[PDB]
Amino acid sequence: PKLPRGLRFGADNEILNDFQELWFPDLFIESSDTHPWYTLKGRVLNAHLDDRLPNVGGRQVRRTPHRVTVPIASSGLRPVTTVQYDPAALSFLLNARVDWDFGNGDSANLVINDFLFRTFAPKEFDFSNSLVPRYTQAFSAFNAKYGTMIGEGLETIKYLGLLLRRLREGYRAVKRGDLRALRRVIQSYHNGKWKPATAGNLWLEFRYGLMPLFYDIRDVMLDWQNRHDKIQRLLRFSVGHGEDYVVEFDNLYPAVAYFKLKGEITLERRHRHGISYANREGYAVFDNGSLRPVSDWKELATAFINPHEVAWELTPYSFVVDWFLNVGDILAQQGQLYHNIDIVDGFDRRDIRLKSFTIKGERNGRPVNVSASLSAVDLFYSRLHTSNLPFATLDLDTTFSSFKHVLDSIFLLTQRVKR
Amino acid sequence: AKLETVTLGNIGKDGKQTLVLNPRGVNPTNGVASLSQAGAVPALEKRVTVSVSQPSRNRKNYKVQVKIQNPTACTANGSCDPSVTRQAYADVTFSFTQYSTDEERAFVRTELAALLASPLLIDAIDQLNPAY
Amino acid sequence: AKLETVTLGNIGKDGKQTLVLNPRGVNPTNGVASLSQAGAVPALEKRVTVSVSQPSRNRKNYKVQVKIQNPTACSVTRQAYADVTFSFTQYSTDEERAFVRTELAALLASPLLIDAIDQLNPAY
Amino acid sequence: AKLETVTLGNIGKDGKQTLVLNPRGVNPTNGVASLSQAGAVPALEKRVTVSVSQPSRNRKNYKVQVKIQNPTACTANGSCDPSVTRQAYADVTFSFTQYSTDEERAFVRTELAALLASPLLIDAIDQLNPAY
Amino acid sequence: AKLETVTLGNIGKDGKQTLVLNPRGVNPTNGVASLSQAGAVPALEKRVTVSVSQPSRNRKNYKVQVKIQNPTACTANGSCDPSVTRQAYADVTFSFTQYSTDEERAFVRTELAALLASPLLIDAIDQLNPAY
Amino acid sequence: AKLETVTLGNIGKDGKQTLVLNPRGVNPTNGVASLSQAGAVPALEKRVTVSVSQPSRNRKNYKVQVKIQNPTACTANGSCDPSVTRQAYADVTFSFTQYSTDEERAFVRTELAALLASPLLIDAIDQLNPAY
RNA sequence: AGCCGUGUUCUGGCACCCUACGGGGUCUUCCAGGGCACGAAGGUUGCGUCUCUACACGAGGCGUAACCUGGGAGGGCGCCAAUAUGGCGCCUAAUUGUGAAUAAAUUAUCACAAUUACUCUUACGAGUGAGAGGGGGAUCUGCUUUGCCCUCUCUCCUCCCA
């Protein structure tokens, strides 16, 4: 009651998504008239008619209420919502201008507005046989289509870990206290036998004496963020197939049995399916109230290169240890993106959309001429969540366990840094 | 906590008056729900605001702010509508952590509610007398 | 100021057509409510935005703004739009505010402004 | 397109034999469904495979392969179980565009079927007679 | 080789426990079908993987691989989530020639089962006592 | 190591603006200092980085570099976060032979200052006009 | 051939500890000496930058947009071998129109000019699919007759190096 319909509380009073309502909502019937009136303006058989009578007789559609979700992952992926709108009969307004000049004194010319008609809706259809095949091949080529980027990401993250380890060595040298031994890393960048000039200082030979290290760190962590972005974008596979289905509308008489209206309506129905992947443990209970942003990822990288920093003259130790700790925090946060990755969500959607139409008036010798434009009011749209996946999936846990291992190791390394 | 007509019954010195704050809306730019007593002059009405700040990345602490404003009439012997002369303000900001608990939240609420009625704060605000 | 479906009848040169404006999300970046045509596509075409900016260090002086936008296509080939801004002081009264609203409506319905809008002719 | 016992009717020269291929399975490593005649010895079963390759970034074309495998028994007068001596292959390779039609591709199928029926291919395969 | 619920009865030292293993998705990258306990958490703990590599220029010599894997875990006194303190697992590998016969393969299966049932392997694993 | 506060004056065309630059640190790699305005915003804080080099191997002359940033700080930007819209770069570079003199350096120094103060460079830096 | 530097390495010590006041084990490198190999932006144009020139002008290098040479990856086709797949060969931006084209007509080669994915009038331009790149930092009580991070830029035979 406190939270909106599609939400619920957790153990420690944390915002969470109510699956029972998300995937199994309470349908309800509705018969809310939208345009239960039509207006004819003009003259027919020398009779100016401008009445306004109703057109809608009875409505009935089942649908679901309004819901709210919240991302259940660091990347911000939201869960899918079960929705239904399956009108018993379709609806399409026709703002046509019927007119026809017949002999023996018989002319008609007027314009119709807010005139709709109900017709059958082909709900019974299933393209599973056509959609299921279009996953296996995609998965098989996946590794052949992105193994390159996954491998370069795996090496980039290990390179980040190596950089952080070298930085940790330098910091530990700083903490223990030594000017000459502190140059262990300094010799790892100059590519040359650098000689001293005078008596230096600990913080002086560490604040920017490691500019190549800082530049490398910034560059390759931006590199990893960029690849990361794509990689998590790569954890989703949506595919759909569309076909055309022409339909006929029953006869109708906008006037009082003065002229008949017939023709055809062109629609297409497309069946779509989308599979997703994420953690299989914390997906149900993902703390959205305590997470770090994504900007601090750039913040930490640029901090050491920032030539504006007063904490180097007040508390170097605190600032550098906080740098470590926040890096480890972000690392652990992104770690959950690769722990036990399996099918977590799945939706199947069936939707109908008009494309074209045709109109033909026939009362006596095909006297009517129609030049109208069609527009729909009600379209069949049914999107249901499903958990049964009757086909071989692409379980991407084994191919990501390495990344999880790497991030855990790096977090251990950085949390091992003490004041 | 949906908005609706709030009617404070007995309030005041002798405890006889009542207040009816009608539902204005919620400024969404800052997530602030507002309530006003029935009138016409925006400058001559008792107003109340309630706001609910979730733990930001730079804060990590739940906040509830509740404000009350009451302006004086000092209506003049003619010459136009009254003029705002004095403005009584009250502000309360409650604060907890993420693993906060309903019970001690209501506890602090009721503690302050009964403090406001105890004789200490009575003459502390009433007569402006330093707590002594 | 509840947001709901608005049925504007007797509009146009001869006051015959009707506009059905359903509400949308109130823009949280600046607190502005929106209404759009019944749809489907015209929803993202036609627009009516409403905001009531309360006093601030630059306002003082409430400012109620109403913007209307009509794009005409055939790709949007033309775009008409209008904007109304009522500035009201804090001591202003709803008497004053309804007077002003009703006066502006009666002006737009008066012959002079139909002449100056529809055919775009200065009062001469 | 569920796999299922395929019973190919009149078959061969006079058109009197019949073939019964049981669904084996579908190798997903390359997305290929396998059918095989009911028997015991894998080396002496009639085999068939069908695959459909979607258009990829380096292909951008619909592909469908149908492969047919016919070993010959040549069982020896005792001395051990039969050994494979000869193996006939058939390899059919349909390829179409993203925008092609069920019409087109059914039509070209039935074209191929009629062609394999027609007298030309008859003696061009059976008799090994060069087309002339 | 349809995949479905497998009910492994009369197992353990006294042959009284039962194991229910449901199927999961088959590894497309190398074609490996998997079962695991009915769940919930033990599903990701216990695993049974089966694969059949068919012949090729590398394979000749069909190869049937059957891995079983049982993680023993527990909960520290004070912890919440169980940690795996041990991992038992075994691998069975059949290599058959293309001329192999269902006859041969079947008795092989049965002989392996009977050996596993025999006192010899019984004590050779249960107690890890070599044959002497 | 430069740790001195500079109280500048006669800023802008009117000459009535004043500024103060407080040190922020030293960059122990290239002999660079850092000075900023009092504040807590990049756009509102003006940057002054002086740098002095000595001959090592790549060059045989000194280098006195001076980089000043005067970002345009906008007030109204959708919130109380004054951002930057126009970054004002001012880069000065010197090169003195190792056999030069403090007299010569002061000579160039004062000539630069006087040209900057005169109406010569003002027309080319502010109004952007060529030498007619 | 010198050596500048890089790498390769070994001798004494730097260091401790031990032995016994006889003498030894060592790791981290470095101080000296010794053994051995080594030093190359493909060309053009265009932009920002470091240094030398100096009236200016220019020059070298740097980082880079784009252009050409070769080379590679994909590359399609056929030839195939035993299916899967292994091997062999051949091949690549292309299409249309204008100049030359033979005495006269075509007219390949070259040049010249445009095109590139679908639907929309074929007018301008719009929509969508696909990919490429960049910026934003994007979660709290949002919608959803769309399934889900927002937005900017570029391409519809490609990508990579000298």
UniProtKB/Swiss-Prot annotation, chain A:
Result when mutating A197T: In strain: TW18
User: What is one GO biological process annotated to this record?
Assistant: symbiont-mediated suppression of host cell wall biogenesis
Q: Where is this region: RNA-binding?
A: 157-175, 225-235, 293-297
Q: Show the InterPro entries listed in the entry.
A: A_protein
Known consequence of changing Y253C? In strain: Qbeta_3
Query: Residues of the signal sequence?
Result: none
Tell me, how does this one assemble? Interacts with host MurA; this interaction inhibits the first step in host cell wall synthesis. Interacts with the capsid protein.
Stated name of the protein: Maturation protein A2
- The source organism is Escherichia virus Qbeta (Bacteriophage Q-beta)
UniProt lineage? Viruses, Riboviria, Orthornavirae, Lenarviricota, Leviviricetes
Curated annotation (Swiss-Prot), chains B, D, E, F:
Give, from the UniProt record, the effect of changing S56P. Answer: Decreased RNA-binding to the viral operator and loss of repressor activity
Summarize the impact of R59C.
Decreased RNA-binding to the viral operator and loss of repressor activity
- Tell me which Pfam families the record gives: Levi_coat (PF01819)
What are the entry keywords?
A: Capsid protein, RNA-binding, T=3 icosahedral capsid protein, Translation regulation, Virion
Localization recorded for this chain is:
Virion
* Family as reported in the entry's similarity comment: Belongs to the Leviviricetes capsid protein family.
Q: Report the protein name in the record.
A: Capsid protein
Name the source organism.
Answer: Escherichia virus Qbeta
Q: What is the lineage of its organism?
A: Viruses, Riboviria, Orthornavirae, Lenarviricota, Leviviricetes
